[PDB]
Amino acid sequence: LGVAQVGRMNFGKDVSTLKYFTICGLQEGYEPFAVNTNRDITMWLSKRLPQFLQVPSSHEHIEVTRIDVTQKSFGSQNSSTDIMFYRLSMPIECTYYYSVRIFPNVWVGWITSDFHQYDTAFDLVTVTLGDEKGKVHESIKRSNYMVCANNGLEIGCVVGLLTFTANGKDLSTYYQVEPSTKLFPAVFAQATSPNVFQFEAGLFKSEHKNPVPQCPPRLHVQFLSHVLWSRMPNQFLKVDVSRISERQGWLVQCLEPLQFMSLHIPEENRSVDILELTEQEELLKFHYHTLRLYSAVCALGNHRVAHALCSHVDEPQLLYAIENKYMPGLLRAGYYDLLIDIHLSSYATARLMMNNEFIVPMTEETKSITLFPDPGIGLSTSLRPRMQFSSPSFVSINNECYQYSPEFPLDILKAKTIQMLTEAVQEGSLHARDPVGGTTEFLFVPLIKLFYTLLIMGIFHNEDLKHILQLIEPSGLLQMKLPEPVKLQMCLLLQYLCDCQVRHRIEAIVAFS
Amino acid sequence: IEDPELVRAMFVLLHRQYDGIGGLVRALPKTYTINGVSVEDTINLLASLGQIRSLLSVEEEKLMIRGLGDIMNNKVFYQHPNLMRALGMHETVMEVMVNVLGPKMVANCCRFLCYFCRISRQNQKAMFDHLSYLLENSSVTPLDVAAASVMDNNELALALREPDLEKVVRYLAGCGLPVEGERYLDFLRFAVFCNGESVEE
Amino acid sequence: LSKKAKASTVDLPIESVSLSLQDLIGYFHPPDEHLEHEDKQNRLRALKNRQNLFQEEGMINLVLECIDRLHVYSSVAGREAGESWKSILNSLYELLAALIRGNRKNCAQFSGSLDWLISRLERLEASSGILEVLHCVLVESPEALNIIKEGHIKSIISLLDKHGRNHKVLDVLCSLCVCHGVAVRSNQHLICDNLLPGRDLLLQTRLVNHVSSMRPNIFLGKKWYYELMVDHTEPFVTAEATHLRVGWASTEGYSPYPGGGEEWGGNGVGDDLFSYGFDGLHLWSGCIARTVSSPNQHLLRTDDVISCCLDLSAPSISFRINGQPVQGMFENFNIDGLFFPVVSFSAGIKVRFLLGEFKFLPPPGYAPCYEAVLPKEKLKVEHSREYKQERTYTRDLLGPTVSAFTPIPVDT
Amino acid sequence: GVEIETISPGDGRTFPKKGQTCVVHYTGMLQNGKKFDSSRDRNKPFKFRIGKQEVIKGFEEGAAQMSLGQRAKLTCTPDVAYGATGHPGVIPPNATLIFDVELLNLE
């Protein structure tokens, strides 16, 4: 689109609004984007606000060099040398200093992370003190990008507060105001001549990472030389709001809440919505592997590490991550396996240890089996083990607490998964090319896995198992076309069903005998 | 069909359909019935049994010693030793000790097994069958369970053979410096007398 | 060449050694997947036989000595023939990964020297080989999991802060806490103690409400003054508290995107936005809240009237609730472009603009915003410049922008 | 001795006595703004008894000054918090805790 243009696309599913698809299209051997999709396909517009980025070889000539004081060289002898905003990767929060050495007008300073004002000039917080009586009105704040101007050895000493030097001569403008802010070391520049920058009382990098004696400074590969660049696509925020308005008094109104699922990178501080990992591969794969480690650490019954991770992944997040039909393929299975390995894989193994012991009391309700009403099992008075769940609060009675598991409500989840299964089979039965995780493995595999582990754990009673058998039997998920690792799960779904009759029949024999 | 876990999980499920009575065969020597007045304690047995079994896969030993202490002092552990013979819980503790023997765990382990033989006759017969490995682990107790497996019953006193005894006097030949002979011979006295009359063979 | 200066020693083959390493790598190569199952077993068995026959003569130690020797410099010697020293060394560790990959018998003999490997893990020039060798050790023997102590795990942790985002570190740590079958619960408390509570090496996640703001189409570049009336609150309809912020914003800069840019979106979040209003109404500017007070410490409740103020030809913004002064302190910011009211919300909140049809206001100072709408414009409301418009078929897309009582007279 | 910021006003007059169980919805975060605990997350109102030494001291002290309807931003100093040891996994060593508590019902 251009300057004052209005566009209107339609990605299928508008066959009634498909105006000329009859006279050209259908009989001419073509198709819309309606042939499979029950979602809305997301749109990726380009951004207006710029955001800083790493430096690949995608310039005519830009080359930062990790050298060993311990500097970072450059080069910009090209056709376009207009504006190149530079910053280091990680910032400092709230004693050490920082060097630059320019040959040819060209600035240095500190960027607070809220900065996207690409401008070829000098411009931009300024709030006064309030002591409830007026009467002070002086200052609390200055900062927002700092400005300074052979070898120019300008050095930004910080903390504490903010100062400056210029080849030994400290200039003015000591912005001594930042309460607990984060400070990017940064450089605004034009480049005239090449080899323009070099970077780096004790010395610097100790005040930055986690080892903090570290008086000899030492570069690491995590340091970068980020450049403010213009455009990267954004997701469309597929369902927005149902705001409503008025005119006599202007009642603007909204009542239907919608919630994000964001994650903020801590060392390059910004919050990304989790859906935009769909195309960003490294930030996908590392978070997937972290979701694996959150399960592998809390494995085989560590009932205190589970109480640690319930404060860290925080259950109403998981109920979003089950439900949202847009999340990527790996990250769906990661959150399902994390749910099972936090709340459900402690008790489920404790019931698959006692699946072949079959002991039963001989009292009056045990004799009361009719044995054969002439899987959704009626009375079932065997002596299966006992589940206890603990609330994961934060008080100092934790030694009695951290002994069983964390708890999160089963009554919601066991209707959520039946709703999800019906929505799954009855939609995906007609062979969409959509399905949620991209391929039908991530659609079904970590849904039937939760369904299996919830089936074992002693819920889905008669009133719901009657609803459950309709999805498989009708007498259908068992009858469809399925790949290999989903019917692998269905075999273990069938085996417990066959194994329920044996537990019925043993209690039948005892009720007779 | 590739992914041969799928083939195996298919055919086991297929064979269980056409052999129902075989499935009922391999489930009847595990069942058991108990009177109602003993419902409440065996759950506290069963829930204290799984803490043993879930501790099978790991200073990690203080849980096991308290678990065996809660099992040994239980009301229904004398009362129906067919149950504890059928739940495999002689083999559970045996496997735990075998996992240890690649210090105070073995000592409070084998005392449970020496408690396990002296409650029934058939239970001692069930305990007997690991003796061939069980003799190879003289630490200093792990030999006491080899003793109290053959302590009293004459049929088990007759059943064991000469290679089981030959490695005992091999260990005695190893005592050719001693002090470890006062226990080894304490095994062999149970091997030849066992009631009051010396078994000829 | 470990002497002072030999400088003439010809007994130093390079192209005969750097060739031979690729021949040994190709000799110890694992068989692929695309192979028949009657010969895949043959090639697997032959590979294990080659690994054991190389084990028994101690070639592991014979390459460990070259690793001991070569980790002196960082770029050496006559520095043109030994130009490929990195590409030898990286190819060296690779050979070490091939000799230990299958045989657990190999892995047991590589138990004792792991501490020296994690000592060399801070070399950070051939760490890719070291991490591969360690990961290809830890899954194959359980005995090699017993040596490794807390000082090693903390070094493995510290590599993850020095080196950004390396998923093979988490492929190591996913195997450090679960062996073949068993769970080494001294390592699981340790990993949970170190890597977790810093919230620094890992991508922390959360869920927030969708933010949205509204503009009543009015543009303003004397004492401008507009009111609100809040009538429905919902302090908690989420597993979190809701937001409701009033204020002003400018037009030249900061397209108002929901959540995906700065932290959480909303209002008072950029420098071009000046906002205020809370339960305990303290302000926002540049998404850091300061703690101004008022003599009730109230909510934006169901019974309140907010008095916002903005000054023409003066850089002063101060607010008022029910007429009471709250010591608004927004002073001396930039004057570029215009200003317009923005008031933001995310709840079941309905609120009333008081502009006309006023309900209760003093005018104090001098300007009402019913007179900024004097010449031709009307009082219609929009959704803060609207890169969306929620509808069924097509949210119609847009082009960016094309951009007052003081013009100039024309001279002759 | 602990920082009690009133957010919403309750009734002011009825502060709870010792020997009563107190119902509270509380959402706690760190000094950085990272939310480490909630009570709205699980839809369960917390319950605790004054003086019985189960809760951390700053929480009980800041709840003892509150009232019915009154919600507060308790800012606990790390000496009254988990301290130099912190908590193993959820709380880094020596950090201030910022709770938004809100009391509901008493005994």
From Swiss-Prot, chain D:
The gene is FKBP1B. Keywords: Cytoplasm, Isomerase, Rotamase, Sarcoplasmic reticulum. PANTHER family: PEPTIDYL-PROLYL CIS-TRANS ISOMERASE, PEPTIDYL-PROLYL CIS-TRANS ISOMERASE FKBP1B. GO terms for cellular component: calcium channel complex; cytoplasm; membrane; sarcoplasmic reticulum membrane; Z disc. Its main location: cytoplasm. This is Peptidyl-prolyl cis-trans isomerase FKBP1B. It is an enzyme of class 5 (isomerase). Belongs to the FKBP-type PPIase family. FKBP1 subfamily. It is found in: Cytoplasm; Sarcoplasmic reticulum. Identified in a complex composed of RYR2, FKBP1B, PKA catalytic subunit, PRKAR2A, AKAP6, and the protein phosphatases PP2A and PP1. Interacts directly with RYR2. GO terms for molecular function: calcium channel inhibitor activity; calcium channel regulator activity; FK506 binding; peptidyl-prolyl cis-trans isomerase activity; signaling receptor binding; transmembrane transporter binding. Has the potential to contribute to the immunosuppressive and toxic effects of FK506 and rapamycin. PPIases accelerate the folding of proteins. It catalyzes the cis-trans isomerization of proline imidic peptide bonds in oligopeptides. The keyword Cytoplasm applies. InterPro entries: FKBP-type_PPIase, PPIase_dom_sf, PPIase_FKBP_dom. Residues 19-107 form the PPIase FKBP-type domain. Its EC number is 5.2.1.8. Disulfide bonds: none annotated. Pfam families: FKBP_C. It catalyses: [protein]-peptidylproline (omega=180) = [protein]-peptidylproline (omega=0). It comes from Homo sapiens (Human).
